[PDB]
Amino acid sequence: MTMMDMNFKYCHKIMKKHSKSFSYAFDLLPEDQRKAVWAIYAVCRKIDDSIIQFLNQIKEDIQSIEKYPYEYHHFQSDRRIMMALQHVAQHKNIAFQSFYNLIDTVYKDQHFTMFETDAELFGACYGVAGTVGEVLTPILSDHETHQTYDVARRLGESLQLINILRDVGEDFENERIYFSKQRLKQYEVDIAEVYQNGVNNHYIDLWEYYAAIAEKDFRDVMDQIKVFSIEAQPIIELAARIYIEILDEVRQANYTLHERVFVEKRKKAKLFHEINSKY
Numbered sequence: 050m051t052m053m054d055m056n057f058k059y060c061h062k063i064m065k066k067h068s069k070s071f072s073y074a075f076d077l078l079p080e081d082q083r084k085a086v087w088a089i090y091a092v093c094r095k096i097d098d099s100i101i102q103f104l105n106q107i108k109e110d111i112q113s114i115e116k117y118p119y120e121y122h123h124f125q126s127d128r129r130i131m132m133a134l135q136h137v138a139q140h141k142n143i144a145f146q147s148f149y150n151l152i153d154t155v156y157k158d159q160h161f162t163m164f165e166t167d168a169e170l171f172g173a174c175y176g177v178a179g180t181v182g183e184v185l186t187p188i189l190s191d192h193e194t195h196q197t198y199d200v201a202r203r204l205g206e207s208l209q210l211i212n213i214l215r216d217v218g219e220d221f222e223n224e225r226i227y228f229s230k231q232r233l234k235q236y237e238v239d240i241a242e243v244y245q246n247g248v249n250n251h252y253i254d255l256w257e258y259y260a261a262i263a264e265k266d267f268r269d270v271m272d273q274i275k276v277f278s279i280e281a282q283p284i285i286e287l288a289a290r291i292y293i294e295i296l297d298e299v300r301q302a303n304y305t306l307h308e309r310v311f312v313e314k315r316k317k318a319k320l321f322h323e324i325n326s327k328y
């Protein structure tokens with residue numbers, strides 16, 4: 050067990066801590082892609098958790114890795130994570146611009162004021178999650194085309210939308226609402242009121258409006274599953290399927306705004322069995 054192995058095992062532990070659905074799937078990858086995913090995840094985890102000066106420190110670590118992949122650096126932020134990311138960058142082509150976009154998005158979030166329209170909202174989904182799909186693309190496909198990026202991007206954006214749809218209650222408590230002003234007006238919905246009084250029909254309708262968008266994007270990703278390498282196809286499908294099942298869970302908890310619903314480990318294995326057998 051080397052120095053490097055210790056970095057990756059740390060990244061892995063971050064991933065298992067913060068993301069039960071994605072680790073479950075992505076730990077099924079062959080060892081070398083598995084480790085690249087752990088490392089990208091943990092960098093994005095840390096960027097997302099930044100908050101100020103830690104975030105600039107990370108941005109600086111990333112920029113050194115870009116300009117000088119084969120040199121030793123004295124990383125300012127988290128050395129275990131940065132070392133692993135740099136090890137990954139030596140063997141794979143990484144879209145640095147895509148981590149800067151994510152970093153910009155976390156900086157802008159400081160000044161978050163609700164989205165006027167669905168197009169600002171989809172613009173944020175790109176920034177938090179569409180970028181992650183882009184950074185992962187060369188790890189999960191052997192030939193990167195524009196098509197491969199487009200599919201990875203859309204997968205990530207629709208996972209963010211599913212995340213939003215799950216976290217409606219806890220997001221309100223943290224003073225955030227991600228549904229667009231325009232769509233809240235149209236459906237006559239006020240999130241404060243729902244939170245206090247329970248679900249109603251206007252809410253379900255607005256909710257299901259977005260759920261249908263996420264579902265349509267999901268189905269469009271699945272019909273293009275082929276852009277990914279053969280070993281990653283069933284994993285990616287698992288990861289997406291698990292995340293989509295979050296949608297059925299929300300409806301069975303009656304769209305509650307007072308708990309985080311989840312897909313249990315036993316359900317995860319059942320979906321894996323299903324995908325597995327189709328392959």
Ligand SMILES: CC(C)=CCC/C(C)=C/CC/C(C)=C/[C@@H]1[C@@H](COP(=O)(O)OP(=O)(O)O)[C@]1(C)CC/C=C(\C)CCC=C(C)C
Pocket residue numbers: 067068069070071086089090091093094097177178181182185186189200201202204205208209212285288
């Ligand atoms: C690198 C990796 C797997 C994840 C990166 C974790 C990142 C970027 C955090 C900073 C930005 C944020 C807030 C992202 C939200 C992730 C919710 O996870 P998390 O909050 O940890 O767990 P949960 O909320 O479920 O408990 C999100 C929904 C985007 C997931 C998009 C993916 C996976 C692209 C898939 C495309 C292909 C697989 C081609």
Ligand SMILES: [Mg+2]
Pocket residue numbers: 212213216
């Ligand atoms: Mg969330």
Ligand SMILES: [Mg+2]
Pocket residue numbers: 212
């Ligand atoms: Mg999240």
